[PDB]
Every structure is written in C-alpha cells, then in structure tokens.
Design a binder for these strands. Structure first.
Lengths: 141, 61, 129, 73, 149
RNA sequence: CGGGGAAUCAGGGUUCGAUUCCGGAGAGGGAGCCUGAGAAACGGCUACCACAUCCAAGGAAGGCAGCAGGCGCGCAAAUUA
RNA sequence: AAAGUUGCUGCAGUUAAAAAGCUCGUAGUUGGAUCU
RNA sequence: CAAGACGGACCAGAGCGAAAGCAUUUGCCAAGAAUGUUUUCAUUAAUCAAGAACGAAAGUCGGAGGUUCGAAGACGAUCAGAUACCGUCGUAGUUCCGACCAUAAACGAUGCCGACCGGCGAUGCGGCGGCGUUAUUCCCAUGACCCGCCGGGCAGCUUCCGG
RNA sequence: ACGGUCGAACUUGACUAUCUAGAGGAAGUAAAAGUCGGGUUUCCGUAGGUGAACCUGCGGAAGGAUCAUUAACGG
C-alpha cells in the first residue's frame, strides 16, 4: 500500500509530482509543448488575414458543407482554419481581409461535425459578424 | 547451401560449408535491418504527408 | 513482522465484537494496551479483563459487552494540539454526543474531553464508539 | 577531520511538510575551527560550537567543547 | 518466517514458568561453573556445553542455577573465543561452500546459497560492530576467510 | 523579482501575486570614474557596442522602464488639462 | 470548485488501465514486552 | 555390430527448489526445508532506490558431434483466380563444452512481512500417545498396516463471515 | 610619455544556435468517366520466409465444452 510513516514526507511529495506528470491536463498545462503548438500562443483571440474560402465537408452521419476560411495569423505567421457561423456570413468576407478569430469552445479540440476546426471568426474588417448578420452596422473595405 | 550432408564428409569441408551458411545468414540479417529502416522512414514521411493534407489543401474552393 | 501491538489488539477486539463473541484473547500485552482498555472500560464500553502474567509479554482476556461499534488505532501517532483537536474529532467521530479520541499526553493516556479539561495536547492513539 | 585546524561537522534535523503533516530528514554540513587544545578528537562525537566573526571563506563558528561518542570510552 | 527461506516454522523451545531450581538438583552454582570451565577446556561452544549439561547432568537451565548464562561465565573467567559462535559457524559454512565451488564450477545453486551465506555473514558482522564485540576495522574478505577459522 | 497578500475552498487542498506597502534590481547594452557624508548615480561625466539629431562637411549634441503625448507592437490599456 | 478523475485526510492494480521472471542487497521508511 | 538421442509405463492436483525448472543404477561432493530441544546469542528484524547472482524456448560467437525431428529450400499434388494446408527429401538448428542475450499467456492474468474472523477430513514430511494384525504365531526392540493428536506444507469440499 | 591596473570592444579558427534567398529532386492533392485491365479455437516470446501483416519451426498459456469405470486381492 502507501507509506504512512512519520518521516515519509519527501517520498509522498516526490511520488505525487512524478505521478502528477501522468495526468493529461497537467501535462498539457505544464510541459510547454502544447503551448508552442497552439497557434494563438496563449491568447484568447488572434487577428489574421483571410487567405482563402474553404468548404469543409461534415463528418459521416451529417451531410453539409460548412463554410470556413483559411487565415494566416499576423503575429507568428501560422495558418489556421476558422468557421464562419451563421448563414450568408461568408458573403461578408472577402479575400485578403482583416479578421479577428477566437477559439470555438472546446479548448483546442475540434467541435461537432466539422473535422479539424478549432476556431471561429468573430470580427471582419474590425466590425462584428453579429452586427453584420443582424444588420446593425455596415462594413468598410 | 541447399545440399544434403552425407556421411563421408570430414573436417575442412563441413566447417567451410558451415561458415558459408553463417555468412549467408549474416548479410541476410544486415539486408533485413536495412529493409526495416527504409520502410520505417517511408512510413514516417507518408504519415507526415497525410497529416499535412488533413491540416490544409482539403476543401471545395 | 509484528509492529504496533496496539493495532493488533484493537483489531482483534473489533473483529471478535463484530462476530458476537463474549471474550477476546489478545497477545502480546503492554502498558499502552492496558491503559487504552482502562479508558475504554471507564466509559462502560468494553467490560473487565484479566492480564495473564506469563513471564514473557503477557496476554489479556477481555470480556465483551455488545455496546461497541468500532474501536480503532491511528497510525502514525500524529501530534495533536488543542487548536487541532476539533478537526480530528470531526474527522474520526460519528457524532458530537459520543465517540472517543484517546491520546497520550504528559498527564497520561486519556480522552479528548479530559485533554480539553486539563488543557493538554499530545499524540493520538485511537477512537472508539 | 582532514584539513588543517578546522573540521567538518554535520547537523541533522527534521523539516516539517504541512500538506502531508509529516517530516523529512535534512542535514547541513559546517566547517568549524578546532583549536589545538582539543586533541584526540575522533569521528562521530558530539561537539558544541559558538558563533563568531568570519574566519575564512566558509568558517563562521568555533568549537567550544567536545563530548565523546556514545560508545567510545 | 525465515531470513533466506520461504519457510515459516514453529520449531523452538518453550521454557516453563518455573524459574526456581528443582529440589532434586543437588548441584551448587560453583560445581556447575567448574563443569562449564572444564568443558570449555575440553573445547566446546556454549551451545554444546548447554546440551551436555542438560542431557547428562540434569541442569535444565544454567542461568536458573548459577544466575548467569554460559558465555558470560566464560568471558568472565576468560575462555571465550575472539569471534562469536554463530559468526564462526557461518564463516566455516561459507569456506566449505567456497571449496565446493572451487571443485565444481557449474553448480549454480552452490553460488546462490553462497551469496545467501555471505549476506548473513555481513548482517552479523554489522550487528557485532555496533555492539563493539568485533573491532570496527574488521571485515570479511573472499580470499582470507579460511585463515580466520 | 521575493514577501505582506489574492481567487477559490466543508476539512485537507489548488492556483495567482508585473501591480500603489516593505525589500531588491536597472535606466538602450556593457565598462570606468569625478564630486560628495552618501552614487560605480545616468533628468552627472568618459569610452566602446547598437541606434539616432543638426550641419555651411570643419564640427556639435543625445538616452521618456518620470508626467502627458506619438510610432510600433499587438486580443489587450486614458488628456501633449 | 465540481475531481475520492493525483486520493495526507482519500483512489486504484483477478477479469475493466495497472504487481517487476525471481532472489539477494545499500541508502530510505518502519521496528516486540520491560524500569513508580 | 556401431552411433547419437531419450529416461515411457510406475507418475498422483504427489514431492523438491528463489524462479526458470527438476524422474535409469551406484558412488562422491557440498547445500536445504520441516519437525524435535527446559541448547546458545539477545533485537541481531521487515520492505527495499543504487548495485548484484540466476533466468524456458528461440537466437549469436568459438570447438566437438550430428539418431530422430526440422524453420529456410527443392520437388509432387490441388484449382474461375491459390502462391497457407497435405506428402517426399532436407540446411541452420535440435545434442555436448566454453562464451554472449535477459525475453514468455516467465499466470494464481492476484507484491512481501505480520494479526484476526466458520467448519470438515484426505494427503506429504516430522514428532507424540496407543489396544491389535503382520516380517510363516517372529525370543525383545524395530519396519508394513490400523486409531487419534500436534507443527509446517501441496491442494480440496462446505458455508447467507463479510465483501 | 613609459609602466601597472580595471576593462568595454575588435580580428582570427572551432563548437555552435537563430534569422533570412534559393536552381533542383522526391511527393500528395483539385481538374481528364482520356489508354489498358476460400481458410481461421484464441494467443505469448523468439527465428526464418521480400518490410509489416500472415505462415512455418521451437518452447509456453486457456483468456478452450470431463462422459463412463474404480468396496474383492484371501486358501
């Protein structure tokens, strides 16, 4: 079993940290290899340039084409794919456009039908997609 | 060597035949290790290519 | 090997109480075991016992009353201060009305209530209820 | 007792860890000056030392008295 | 259980409660002590002396009659050996196993049992060094062991 | 940067603490000084390294991690009162 | 925090993830009564 | 007649060994458990990072030897498409000696030491107590059985102990 | 001005680490309906058979579905 002596403190804490390294979330947070593979680089949001528009095919039980965008982030040059949520909202996006992107909700994990998309478009040309969709504001170019 | 080992063979024939067999096995294992290495390298590069296709250049437009 | 003879004695008492028996033989004997049984006797929990005085470590046969639920040891013998005795009696005891932390202090082996009365702390030995 | 007129002693203690409520064994070595008035000092006997001013790069204490080992007559 | 075996046996002595010398035993402590002295002069370990005294002379326990145990009497007069009895027997057993392994090289079980005997020798030597019975510079070495016996 | 401390929490714990209080360090980077009770000081000096201002082309003058303010950087932060 | 899914309090290790092929052995940890 | 191999049946839920494993006779060699002891020492202990011995089969180096079997390999059959199965031969190997390797479903898919909590009678070894049958009634002990009891074992059955 | 001291930094090779252009090679992807077309109970370790899978050899497991017989042995 466990050691329960009055002098077993360093054995307990050493075994604790060694088996702490076997925790998946702990190893994601503390090893520092997931943070450098993360394109946002420990940021809630990133801002990039639209490279192209992509139709991503939905996974097996669902049949749909999800309108996504290949973006290159400004601060590190990495390339990501971001989902444009509502219907007709890809038409508000043009090529070589300035776009604010956030994660999609599962912390770097792909969500739902879309294979390999962790990000969603929040703002297009420094105006929100919500205000464009609801028709509150107009978009410059 | 694909030859029967009869009874009349003595020393300096049996040992030479055995040494030839041992050499055949030796370069045979060397070639086997080289094949393992080449197939491993090819599998790593094709998995890299498949993951690159998963990340980008896969869509309609 | 046999370490902590108090743990063996308390486990034997618990196991034969759970079985419904009337008497328990526990070997070896010690001063700590006799003091623990004296404390546990004064609260009417166990009954009265004989120390079979062989020339080795003695034996004890203790009568059993059906009033015991659980008697137990705490290993290791942690240091308990009066500021920390409330947490121990919250952790180990089923209720605030009954149950007993036995502890050894420089005033002797006693209960947590007598330790509060005499304003002393010590090292924990057990609990029974 | 190998360098000239100073010795290395070891002080042992238990450091408390609050999470596990336990202890760990720790030690520290000290170089302390040993005067020639304490001769026939052996290895493994208890020494009482007193703090003084720095005497070298590492020596800060000085041997005050020597009590022999538990087994040594 | 055993130190180096899987066995957990119960074969041992059981002294009685009665520490008093039996009334039929018409031997004083001095007679038993001189008997111990002459048996040691004949040359016997204290186990052998105790067995001879128990079997033939009717002495149930030496320390119940004389008040002192055999090896302390031998040390007090001065016939105690320099190395202890059990350590001597272990070293002798190790020497015999080493001789067998010198004769027979492929005997792996003899090597394994020799390793166990050396472990027991080192344990006893450490214990005797703590009690200042052996000198602190004492050591068991592979080559010069048969000289000690 | 370290503490005082903060969030959360039955009990035990986990995590945060650049940030107004105390202590340390440094003024683009290193190095050497003068004065002085006190500085290896930079709203003092002298160099080299990197930047960069005015030139009549010989020379001269620099140091906002002070207050506002500007550029840049970025998901990210205010008035030259 | 939920997470007794890092478990000191307080987790697991037949079949679900898991006990080293086996033994010896140093440091470490723990160590039977007994003295008003 | 010779060669190398292998020790069947007896052979069991029997035994021994740390495990891997271990079965022809006899002799020699050192070990070992258990039991028995009113022997001796008197805490000398348990579990163990580092370190160290042993570790099936297969495989690799040197030598010896190759009976059987036999990966590879060569043939013969078999079919819309057969290239695994099947049969004959057969190399490394399978055997021994000396060096390496340190792996198995290396299994009880169950760490070791210690304590307590139901029962029963078979077996292995040792010890104890016995009325009897047998060594052609044995002259006394001793071996083989028979009835119990104790200690350590390999296992079994039974149970609504508790999980 | 000689000398000493503290010492920024400069040059030369090695060990490197980073930034930044590249002829070429090997690829994949979107565009061409263009041309030709039966075996296995389940495994483990090692070795061979073209790398893996799979098969075979050697040694191991069950994590694989026990029916029937068994009181005499003395003359």
């Amino acid at each position: 079993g466990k050691c329960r002596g009055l002098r077993t403190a360093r054995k307990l804490r050493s075994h604790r940290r060694d088996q702490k390294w076997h925790d998946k979330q702990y190893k994601k947070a503390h090893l520092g290899t997931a943070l450098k593979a993360n394109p946002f680089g420990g940021a809630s949001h990133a801002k990039g340039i639209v490279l192209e528009k992509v139709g991503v095919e939905a996974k097996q039980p669902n049949s749909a084409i999800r309108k996504c965008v290949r973006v290159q982030l400004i601060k590190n040059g990495k390339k990501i794919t971001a989902f444009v949520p509502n219907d007709g909202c890809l038409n508000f996006i043009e090529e070589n456009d300035e776009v604010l992107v956030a994660g999609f909700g599962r912390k770097g994990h792909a969500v739902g039908d879309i294979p390999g998309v962790r990000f969603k478009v929040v703002k297009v040309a420094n105006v929100s997609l919500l205000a464009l969709y609801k028709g509150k504001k107009e978009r410059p170019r | 060597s694909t030859q029967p080992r009869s009874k009349n063979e003595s020393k300096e024939d049996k040992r030479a035949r055995k040494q030839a067999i041992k050499e055949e096995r030796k370069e045979r294992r060397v070639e086997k290790k080289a094949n393992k290495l080449a197939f491993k390298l090819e599998k790593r590069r094709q998995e890299k290519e498949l993951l690159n296709l998963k990340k980008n250049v896969e869509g309609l437009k | 090997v046999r370490m902590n003879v108090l743990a063996d004695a308390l486990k034997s008492i618990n196991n034969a109480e759970k079985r419904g028996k009337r008497q328990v033989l526990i070997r070896p004997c010690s001063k700590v075991i006799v003091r623990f049984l004296t404390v546990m006797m004064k609260h009417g929990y166990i009954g009265e016992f004989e120390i079979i005085d062989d020339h080795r470590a003695g034996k004890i046969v203790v009568n059993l009353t059906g009033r015991l639920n659980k008697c137990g040891v705490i290993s290791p013998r942690f240091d308990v201060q009066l500021k920390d005795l409330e947490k121990w009696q919250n952790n180990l005891l089923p209720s605030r009305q009954f149950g007993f932390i036995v502890l050894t202090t420089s005033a002797g082996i006693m209960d947590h209530e007598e330790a509060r009365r005499k304003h002393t702390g010590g090292k924990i030995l057990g609990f029974f209820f | 007792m190998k360098m000239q007129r100073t010795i290395v002693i070891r002080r042992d203690y238990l450091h408390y860890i609050r999470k596990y409520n336990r202890f760990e064994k720790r030690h520290k070595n000290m170089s302390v000056h040993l005067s020639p008035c304490f001769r026939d000092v052996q290895i493994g006997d208890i020494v009482t030392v007193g703090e003084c001013r720095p005497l070298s790069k590492t020596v800060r204490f000085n041997v005050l008295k020597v009590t022999k080992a538990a087994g040594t007559k | 259980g055993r130190m180096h075996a899987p066995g957990k046996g119960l074969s041992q002595s059981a002294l009685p409660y009665r520490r008093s010398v039996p009334t039929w035993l018409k031997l004083t402590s001095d007679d038993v002590k001189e008997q111990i002295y002459k048996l040691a002069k004949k040359g016997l370990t204290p186990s052998q002396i105790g067995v001879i005294l128990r079997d033939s002379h009717g002495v149930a326990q030496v320390r119940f009659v004389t008040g002192n145990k055999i090896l302390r009497i031998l040390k007090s007069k001065g016939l105690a050996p320099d190395l202890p009895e059990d350590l001597y027997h272990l070293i002798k057993k190790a020497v015999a196993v080493r001789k067998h392994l010198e004769r027979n090289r492929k005997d792996k079980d003899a090597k394994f049992r020799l390793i166990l005997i050396e472990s027991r020798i080192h344990r006893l030597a450490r214990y005797y060094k703590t009690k200042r019975v052996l000198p602190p510079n004492w050591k068991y070495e592979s080559s010069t062991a048969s000289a000690l016996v």
